[PDB]
Design a protein around this ligand. Structure first.
Ligand SMILES: CC(C)(C)n1cc2c(n1)C(=O)CC1(CCN(C(=O)c3ccc4n[nH]cc4c3)CC1)O2
Ligand SMILES: CC(C)(C)n1cc2c(n1)C(=O)CC1(CCN(C(=O)c3ccc4n[nH]cc4c3)CC1)O2
Lengths: 723, 733
């Protein structure tokens, strides 16, 4: 029954739509096996029910035989009991049916997709889209093809040309007969004693020919744009994804691309016709993984459909069950109560990931800041200068942004359409934001914020932005501002931590300071961190110049001081004066290097975490080895306090964030140190139910209008009040 | 005096700071309002040369913080600024606001500590920004700075000692820096104990106070300045959404200063004044070679104007001030006020003269503003001389600017049909790099033109609060390898996002010779923002999934073409050898027939029939049509906004249905002129009737609250001077 349609899809290198929930069931089971191999699953752990529009065109869960779809767009509401949600979590799966009219988007497919998107959106549940299509549906008025006539310039010579296309009374009568007179817009003329119905416009009786499909593209593009802000959106490019299909992948932002499946706008063949040469060899050349994964359009790659489904399910494990719910806490064997083992040094080169997830070493595993094996890196193929991913801190999921200290290189391919173009390698220095790494940073902030609704840790380590001509021309200023904007829009706790060996300077600090979003942001610097406007060399150039360098010499070098003192003798011969002056300038020459080194140390001494603390720009200075223990309780307390704020907001609401926490903090016992993270979180957790109870406890003219209608006895009272 | 014998006082001698500013190639802060007064007067002269102005037309009042740090107006001598950041609240009677309009001017003082940003400057800038934001008035920033303020603990400089490896040889090195008991006592004496963090050590029976951290007693040395940068960056980011923001790069703008230029989005750069993050000299020290020759090489107009970071260029400070004043003339006096209607000699009631042809090359601008021609001026869609193009140096494939349609200001996006070229400079740091010319075909969205489109939509929406017309004419996006690799997909999606966020009427008009296809229609369909968007297609426009040639390739292949030859050719039909020879003969003409057939589907009439466009239009009548449509839309929009005051929350489809019902029987809802006229003729009547309803419901509510819980409410009624006086009069009658 489904055997033919199944092969038809496999032939196209994709899974048949109705076979996808099975892959989700497999991925969900694997998820369990990796979490606790000793957990035995029942069929009630995973449930998939198709979504079909009812009598009133409203989407509803159903139990129906697969492949009975009257349209090329299908949907499922999945309910899974997962390690993070053992009682269950739900999401929606929208997918094109590649077997139904080549996976094209017609008005019906567009309306359904939109309805499904709104369904997920209304319920706050994630929307998963499986892209396997050929873009907007193309058509012509087939009923007109055997009917249309040609008004020849000379009927004896067709090469002399034609004036217009028309219908005869016969052709017009054939359309009337079949109830199709609205298929064309004609204009009656008489030529050679015959009614000629000049075709002014061809409309077609059949729907889904052109513009109507395009209106649908627009509708679904705007709907996706909207959904990205509202719920968790992800796309699996399971087969080719063309035109509107390509836009849907980017519009849902988060994308996993199956190796060998292209994300294209226009096919290689068409591009060759427009170019008038065989320029492009394939669609993969235009939109394969080597294009999209390198761009950052595709966040991850997959070997097959199951691999992709597994990566969706893994990504979702960091995402709340639905909008506004708390982030899914999933504690594992690597608990919070341990020091951080891997510590960077300025003398040995390191991979940030060792600091994040830890490092396998000959003498055993060196634990990092986050939970062993909790780091799920995304956008791994693009702007490799920044390291972005999801991690867990003692069970708490969060977004992580780290800085790649190593020089990063990337190949820009040769433009097939330009024979006077060659491939290009670009090298970018570590600890510097470039247009790409700045864009990725802003992108990461946004993706963690929207739908994922995650807290975030930026392990801040940037010298600044690349200020040179190339990068300035490639709009580094634009991409850096995105970071500020992304930070302003943030809605969950943010932690900015300058790690050991880390730094932040004038250009990099501007975009990460907590004052950007005081509601969510906090900054911390490691004891082995550095921050100042400029790097020591730059600061001495401005603030410890020659005059200062010569004063320090007079104070410190005996030889310099003595020679300067010899120049106080008002009895000197000019020649002798020139001699002492010469010896002094020769001592300055001799001392300039080391006194320059002294100045660098003096500048560096201002750039410390202790000055940052003293100046009130950071919350606390920290020791890397204790950062895990510290941050775990800080994040935990922040999330609890954030919950109570959200609760207080949904009752009163008419107060500032500052006013809302001050009230909440006033409910804590007097002996509770508000600066003690572990104590606060513990008290809150021990008292959620108790707190919930605590929580559960122009006009002057209208005022004149009613006051007048009141009784005499009442008016007498309010008269006394006015008096 | 320098010079002596001048007829009038030497302004540069009376205030030496003025000469310092000039010596840096910028205008003295305190002389900027004078330039605003000149620009405002020129504005009047160009509008109506026969208008006599009095000095009361322009007023500038310096804003300084009071005892409580609240911004207050002052009249004081220039150069009295105790901080390097100065502000003015300007009040001008302008052609668009003849009774007056107000804005705020924030500027760095380049003479005060080299225009650096210290915590005080940052706090003032933020306060000023909040001042403008609270009042809904525009915020103009004049950038002339050296970024964040750099400092060291000057009190430590004459005190610090060096622990030498060998005191006899300084080149052998040093261990650390320290203080003596004497230096420690010196700090205590001056109440500066907190300047350093020391650690007491005894080296050879001598007390050494090892310097562990230098803090400094003086504020504005490092990180505190950086916290200020962050605060002002976020404040600007916020203001861009709230009020009209613009920046004039009047002298160099460094670090945080460069970020402020971009963060306020709209920027005018004075030729020869750089927008830089790091100076060329420093970059040369970091690189270890003389790579860069100047700061202009990094952030001059040839970099920023070409980038789209700088929206416009200026020859001098006045030119820049003139361009600010011109740009503001399309912006409401303050947030949420109606767009400033400024009717000129070119009224709405006229046909459009310049019409493009399918066979001949044209500049979109001729369609927009009109064209000077040998036989006289050919009027365009908008008001003669009303087109103010911005971002003119970047992504020249799209034409963006402000215009007026019969006095109504709006944002305009047009498509450059000509091939556009741009020079990508050679990277000075890479000797294996050369300059590159890139050519981009007309009527196609590329990463740059897509970015500019989205940028334009955003800039018209935020602060400017303008309606917008997109003269939609795109084949699609460049889907080829280079552009796909250069993330065209990302930049195109920005357009969708930008459209979603739009808050004023949008008109999508496919003009004559215009087109929209599968790839380009996706990002401009009205369903993206049904609340604001409408689409129209000219009678000579085209729209379909693919271009005719693409559609025949899929839907009118050989078999169909030969069946067509069989029907429409006696010779071919009779033959059903010689048949293949007739196919050969007919192929070129039947290809034209198949293409015409295909094209016949791509018409405005099919768009109308399919319900994808509001109306199909004739270009020559588009001005007359759009004027009244926009006018009618703005009047309805205002009444929807006015209804967002009425007792109870309602959808916009509810609000429009309500407003529309009120229209008298004689008012044709399809007549844009009648509907706009009715709204305007009855605004006072509507406002009155509406007020009487917010009151009537308030009156009903209080009687409800009172006719149950009497005594308890009468006490609260009692609980709730000038107001008491009114209520007393009411009770007395
Ligand atoms: C070249 C590359 C490594 C990409 N890079 C590396 C950068 C940048 N570019 C930049 O465009 C920014 C930056 C920030 C940090 N820097 C300073 O603080 C600085 C200032 C003044 C100085 N004078 N002498 C030495 C100095 C150092 C150097 C420039 O780092
Ligand atoms: C000029 C250039 C930049 C190369 N360009 C010009 C473009 C693109 N690129 C594109 O990547 C997209 C596009 C869109 C409009 N097009 C069609 O609708 C179309 C489809 C199929 C076809 N088959 N034969 C001829 C055909 C035409 C052509 C390709 O325009």
């Amino acid at each position: 029954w489904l055997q033919p349609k199944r092969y038809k899809a496999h032939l196209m290198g994709t899974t048949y739509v109705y076979d996808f929930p099975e892959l989700f069931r497999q991925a969900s089971s694997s998820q369990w096996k990796n979490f606790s191999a000793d957990v035995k699953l029942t069929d009630d752990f995973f449930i998939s029910n198709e979504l079909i529009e009812d009598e009133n065109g409203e989407l509803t869960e159903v139990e129906r035989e697969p492949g009975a779809n009257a349209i090329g767009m299908v949907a499922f509401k999945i309910t899974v009991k997962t390690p993070e949600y053992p009682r269950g979590r739900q999401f929606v799966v929208v997918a094109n049916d590649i077997t139904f009219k080549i996976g094209s988007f017609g008005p019906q497919e567009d309306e359904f997709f939109n309805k499904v998107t709104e369904y997920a959106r209304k319920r706050g549940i994630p929307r998963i889209y499986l892209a396997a299509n050929s873009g907007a549906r193309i058509g012509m008025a087939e009923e007109i093809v055997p009917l249309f006539q040609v008004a020849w310039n000379d009927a004896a010579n067709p090469d002399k040309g034609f004036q217009y296309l028309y219908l005869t009374s016969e052709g017009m009568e054939t359309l009337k007969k079949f109830d199709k007179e609205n298929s064309v817009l004609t204009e009656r003329t008489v030529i050679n004693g015959e009614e000629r119905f000049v075709i002014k416009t061809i409309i077609g009786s059949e729907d889904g020919l052109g513009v109507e499909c395009l209106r649908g593209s627009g509708l679904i593009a705007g709907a996706t744009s909207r959904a990205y802000h509202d719920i968790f959106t992800i796309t699996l490019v399971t087969c080719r994804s063309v035109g509107i299909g390509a836009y849907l992948v980017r519009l849902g932002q988060r994308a996993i691309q199956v190796e060998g499946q292209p994300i294209i706008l226009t096919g290689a063949s068409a591009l060759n016709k427009v170019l008038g040469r065989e320029v492009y060899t394939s669609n993969l050349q235009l939109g394969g993984t080597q294009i999209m994964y390198n761009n950052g359009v595709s966040h991850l790659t997959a070997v097959d459909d199951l691999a992709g489904v597994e990566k969706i399910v893994e990504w979702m494990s960091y995402v709340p069950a639905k909008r506004n719910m708390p982030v899914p806490i999933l504690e594992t064997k690597d608990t919070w109560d341990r020091p951080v083992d891997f510590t960077p040094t300025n003398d040995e080169t390191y991979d940030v990931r060792w600091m994040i997830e830890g490092r396998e070493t000959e003498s055993g595993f060196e634990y990092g800041l986050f939970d062993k094996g909790s780091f799920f890196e995304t956008l791994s193929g693009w702007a490799k200068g920044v390291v972005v991913g999801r991690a867990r801190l003692g069970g708490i999921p969060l977004g992580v942004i780290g800085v790649e200290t190593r020089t990063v290189e990337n190949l820009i391919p040769a433009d097939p359409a330009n024979p006077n173009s060659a491939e290009t390698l670009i090298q970018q220095a570590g600890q510097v934001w470039f247009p790409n790494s700045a864009f990725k940073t802003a992108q990461a902030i946004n993706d963690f914020n929207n739908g994922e609704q995650l807290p975030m840790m930026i392990l801040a380590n940037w010298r600044g932005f690349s200020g040179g001509q190339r990068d300035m021309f490639n709009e580094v200023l634009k991409y850096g501002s995105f970071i500020v904007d992304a930070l302003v829009d943030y809605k969950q706790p943010i932690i900015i931590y300058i790690p050991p060996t880390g730094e932040l300077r004038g250009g990099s600090w501007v975009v990460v300071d907590p004052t950007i979003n005081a509601d969510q942001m906090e900054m911390y610097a490691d004891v082995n961190a550095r921050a100042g406007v400029l790097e020591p060399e730059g600061t001495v150039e401005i603030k410890f110049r020659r005059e200062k360098l010569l004063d320090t010499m007079n104070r410190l070098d005996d030889k310099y001081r003595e020679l300067r003192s010899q120049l106080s003798n008002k009895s000197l011969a000019p020649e002798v004066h020139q001699q002492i002056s010469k010896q002094l300038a020769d001592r300055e020459r001799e001392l300039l290097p080391i006194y320059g080194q002294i100045s660098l140390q003096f500048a560096d001494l201002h750039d410390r975490s202790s000055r940052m603390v003293a100046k009130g720009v950071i919350s606390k200075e920290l020791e890397w080895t204790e950062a895990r223990r510290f941050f775990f309780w800080r994040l935990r307390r922040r999330l609890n306090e954030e919950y109570l704020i959200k609760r207080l907001s949904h009752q009163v609401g008419e107060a500032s964030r500052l006013e809302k926490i001050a009230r909440i903090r006033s409910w804590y016992p007097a002996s509770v140190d508000h600066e003690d993270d572990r104590q606060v979180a513990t008290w809150i957790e021990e008292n959620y139910k108790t707190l919930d109870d605590k929580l559960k406890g122009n006009a002057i003219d209208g005022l004149s209008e009613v006051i007048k209608m009141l009784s005499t006895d009442d008016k007498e009272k309010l008269l006394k009040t006015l008096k």
